[PDB]
Enzyme design. Sequence first.
Site, PDB file in Angstrom:
ATOM      1  N   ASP A 129       0.837  -1.189   0.000  1.00  0.00           N
ATOM      2  CA  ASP A 129       0.000   0.000   0.000  1.00  0.00           C
ATOM      3  C   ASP A 129       0.879   1.249   0.000  1.00  0.00           C
ATOM      4  OD1 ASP A 129      -2.461   1.255  -0.333  1.00  0.00           O
ATOM      5  OD2 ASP A 129      -2.957   1.217   1.838  1.00  0.00           O
ATOM      6  N   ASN A 151       0.598   7.242   2.781  1.00  0.00           N
ATOM      7  CA  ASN A 151       1.098   6.246   3.714  1.00  0.00           C
ATOM      8  C   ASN A 151       2.603   6.425   3.951  1.00  0.00           C
ATOM      9  OD1 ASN A 151      -1.506   5.085   3.897  1.00  0.00           O
ATOM     10  ND2 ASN A 151      -1.049   3.462   2.445  1.00  0.00           N
TER      11      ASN A 151
END
Lengths: 262, 297
Positions: free
Chosen positions: B128, B133
């Site tokens: 991800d 992130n």
Amino acid sequence: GVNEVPDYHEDIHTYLREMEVKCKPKVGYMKKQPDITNSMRAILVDWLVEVGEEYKLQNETLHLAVNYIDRFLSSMSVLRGKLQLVGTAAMLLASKFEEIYPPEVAEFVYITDDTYTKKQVLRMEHLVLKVLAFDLAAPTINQFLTQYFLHQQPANCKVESLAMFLGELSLIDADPYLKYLPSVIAAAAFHLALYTVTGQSWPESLVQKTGYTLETLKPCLLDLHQTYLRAPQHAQQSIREKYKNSKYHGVSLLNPPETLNV
Amino acid sequence: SMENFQKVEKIGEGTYGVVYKARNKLTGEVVALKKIRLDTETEGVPSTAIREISLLKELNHPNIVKLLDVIHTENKLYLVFEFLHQDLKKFMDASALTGIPLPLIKSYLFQLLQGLAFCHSHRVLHRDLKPQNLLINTEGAIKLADFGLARAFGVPVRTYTHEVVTLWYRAPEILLGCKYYSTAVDIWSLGCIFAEMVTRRALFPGDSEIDQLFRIFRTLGTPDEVVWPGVTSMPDYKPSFPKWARQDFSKVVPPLDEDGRSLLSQMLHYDPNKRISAKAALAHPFFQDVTKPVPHL
Ligand SMILES: O=C1CC(I)=CC=N1
Ligand SMILES: O=C1CC(I)=CC=N1
Ligand SMILES: O=C1CC(I)=CC=N1
Ligand SMILES: O=C1CC(I)=CC=N1
């Protein structure tokens, strides 16, 4: 190619070895458990094999679950009535860790025949988590086997299946296999299996990888041969039943060798 | 349990409820707390958290967010994280007009690859990687974060969950629906992110999977067996895909030098097998002069 992660196979191996040491159960835990025994543990693991087969779970999930169980029993006194509760909870945790599509908790309650409530399963889950301090990423026999099967230039379905099988038989029997690291048991299973089928030994390529010679792998290989030989007489049969199926190419039905040569 | 944490402000909201910035009353440490509600009568501790906690426990590197503690109750889990200033996305947007200095881009990508090299050297796929992130502080560091969609893999890899990366950062192998994927998917994502740091726009902003696919072909050239062997016998590949040509990275990432364009192409190679590894990329000539600049905040 990239699925065998060449730029990383070495580093991962090193790391798994270092990790299989820290995640190793206490070798003599069963003696310090007043109310449970290797025999009862055997029943438990055999029940997980069934469960693994009924819910079509990965073999890796089964291995982890057993890793979780031995380490918990290495820290916590458990009564016989709750041994299953620990195992259900461990299988649950391993499923969550490892499976794409884990069974719902309800199905883990279904398989204990309503011996336990959902609340008990879920509470035991948390307790297991606290006792292992969330160190769930344990190296398994399979994590070593899959890598060993790679150095097997002549890729053999039969050899690959057979090693898995010997692999799983070792799960059942705390004595002796608690006193061997996964990496070792994987080699002994991998040696024993190759010989039985092709006629060949632990390859040098895997000697250079692991630092494991057949000299250092003999004690384990001895117990394994024994385990293989007594296999049809073992009080626990689920694994033999499992590896009859076409899926695993009926390797269980094959007759073990009678001598190993050393 | 949480008596020593004072809530400051809300800083995000992701897989598990809300993330809050908080202050250790006794030590003065600032932290990010993630509150995960435990389904005590239904599903228990979510698989996402089992995976994040267990994997972050192992992963101790300067470019991976530190999990400092896990505080249990009967009914909730609080994860105590180091606090980092903001995510790359917020920094990017704040830099939309001023641009990001090339030296900082290089420093950031270098660190990202160091973090990621560590994750892969430890049987872990992030899966991800996207600007939202990745966390930066004020002293010039960047760190991989949010390890919820992460997975410890075996060797060789087996079939893992197919619904993984956020569409924009999804590798072609996952789009085309291949049975196996590996560390290459995370490299693809970083490659997307390199481009984005340079231009401050997303490289492949697709509305759909079919659109995502077309967006990549148009830029990197509709792949063929000569570039990506097996591409035509891929599950979701179609003979019909128009045959666009590869665009010059001098129009793709105009601001990027001869070394950058080289490393990028390597990171964005179609074939997973021929795609660079984080380890390889760490050696690339691009980083020969790498420094550690501080971001303008
Ligand atoms: O229901 C069960 C539990 C166990 I442990 C073994 C067999 N059946
Ligand atoms: O009880 C709590 C929750 C949170 I979020 C921060 C501090 N105390
Ligand atoms: O109490 C804790 C902290 C951490 I970091 C991991 C697991 N349990
Ligand atoms: O560790 C973290 C998480 C978040 I959301 C923001 C900043 N630091």
